[PDB]
Amino acid sequence: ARFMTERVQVGGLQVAKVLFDFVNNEAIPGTGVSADTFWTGAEAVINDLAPKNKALLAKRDELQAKIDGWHQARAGQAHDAVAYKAFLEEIGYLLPEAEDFQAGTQNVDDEIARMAGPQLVVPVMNARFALNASNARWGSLYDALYGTDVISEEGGAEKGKGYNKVRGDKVIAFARAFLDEAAPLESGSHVDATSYSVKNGALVVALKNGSETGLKNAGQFLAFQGDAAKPQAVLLKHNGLHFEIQIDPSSPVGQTDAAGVKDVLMEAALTTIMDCEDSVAAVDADDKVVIYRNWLGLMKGDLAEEVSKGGSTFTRTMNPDRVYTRADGSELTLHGRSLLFVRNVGHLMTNDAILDKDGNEVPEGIQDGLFTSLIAIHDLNGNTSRKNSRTGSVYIVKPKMHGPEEAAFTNELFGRVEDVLGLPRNTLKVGIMDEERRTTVNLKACIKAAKDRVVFINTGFLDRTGDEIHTSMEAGAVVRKGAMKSEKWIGAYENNNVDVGLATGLQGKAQIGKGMWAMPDLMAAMLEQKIGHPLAGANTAWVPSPTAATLHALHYHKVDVFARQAELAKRTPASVDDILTIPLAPNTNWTAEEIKNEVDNNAQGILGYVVRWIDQGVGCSKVPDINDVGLMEDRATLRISSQLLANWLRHGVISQEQVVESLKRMAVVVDRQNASDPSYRPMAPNFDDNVAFQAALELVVEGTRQPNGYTEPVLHRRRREFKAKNGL
């Protein structure tokens, strides 16, 4: 028997037993909501909103088909932008710009509304990653520098396995230069400090020449830990972000330092998105329970994992808040943890963890809203040892929405969930991903549809490129994947998001955010390049790891984002006509070598990701590209690569035999790259029977058939196929 799920009858619903029991025995106790109340309300929401959800998806399909037909009816003609835009308007794709308004969201935590800094995104299915992300609010700058390529190993500065002082002295010097910039002394350089102490309410820095100095701006000093005359830490603030100079002259690093400094502790990942979507693989009730159970551990504060470090073992847990003494004897407490959002899945998928009264699968987005909000009640009512929101809000990221009617449906869904759970109206806040064309070109109206719930807008630029390719699939051959960043549309898309965010009053109430740095080991490059995100007026942007959060925090000390937003609020707004410029290749006269490099690079990226998704249920993998650069891959990069190959195939840039040959060749490369993993099974040489290879092949050769180019229908089907065959 194929795909087996044991269910029980719950009113008119059929609920997977594993999920029923998880909700009743783990999520519900401590919320003050009875299981009967919850399940009866859930069934009402499902029965009312599932038909609306289905009609929204039918509308996507209808519009894509009309666009397909529009280009087909104009095969071989030069693109007529004016006729295209009248068509998009007449069919209801491009809607009138929304009337002016200001967002009304209230009760937003400071990390979102009033601060600028990094935002970490991690798969919530991995409890170790989730724990580290919760704790990444504070990060060791010395560890981030010593451990990454920010500091070159040249000149005998190798990391090695111990503490290489040659390297460590470079780390220390980099950090002193940061201190000179972010907390300048009135005289001299932190490089010459011999002592940090507190006297008469001010930081006093003794220098090697025997004099003492204060800070140039003495108000940057806030508080300390330990004795004022010999503090263990001094707490500073700059651009709204905190950092500690940590002092211990008996520590291995401290005893090499004239002032005993052992580290600089940076306030780093202000917020974290615990992901249930593009970075996880969860295809059935068993997988979804694991997801929900980790979110539950975060919301109750008891998420914990045993880890082997040193020779022994200890239990990793969520860190407490941090306590400091002010010079007047009062106590100052800082949040010890990143403020958590949860990313629900979007409107597309259904799953068979719940069947409705007609035996149909229930939309997964509706389920996530019910279950993740139920679980968040543990935070809202204080049934937790680790508070998340201090304002009575839950922060849900809603991805992959197309246009303002779909934003209104999320607003409606969240209100219905609140009613089921007895939550005050607008408790459930929404982070709106701007990552689909129909949202971009209607963005102001999309925000307006959730104007009292909005807590962010963010340019998921990789999904957005995937939608760009699928939407104009029939128009012609698109440019190479690496050429997209220079096309007209994408710069206008990024600027539009900031312009609309500022014009709709998000400042002071929500984040205007930007995308993920996807090269986890190229931290020197990240430090060079990602300053562009705060310079663009985004008060947050995505990083892949706690280390990258610590390093990206340095950018917010170089750029005052809110002041930058004031400047950018004056510029001419981005043009929808630029956004409507389809990234078609001027001609298809690429060198045969150029074509081979594009096909091979996409084929490797697809296969390196898909094999781990299908065989191991891993939704986020680092995959070397054909230059051996390690790329962080999730479903959004798979969407781009599969859709580009489908597009080149559809327009005869490449042949099917060609794409198949490249996939087989790059599969062998992928197998080699994974050969040292004992849990890895190769794809070659039996490609016909290999589920993962067939999944990759389907996404490419049938890329034109996937709804808006989404990869989940194939991945979910094939992962379940693999799980069933192997007893997983």
Ligand SMILES: [Mg+2]
């Ligand atoms: Mg905290």
Ligand SMILES: [Mg+2]
């Ligand atoms: Mg997304």
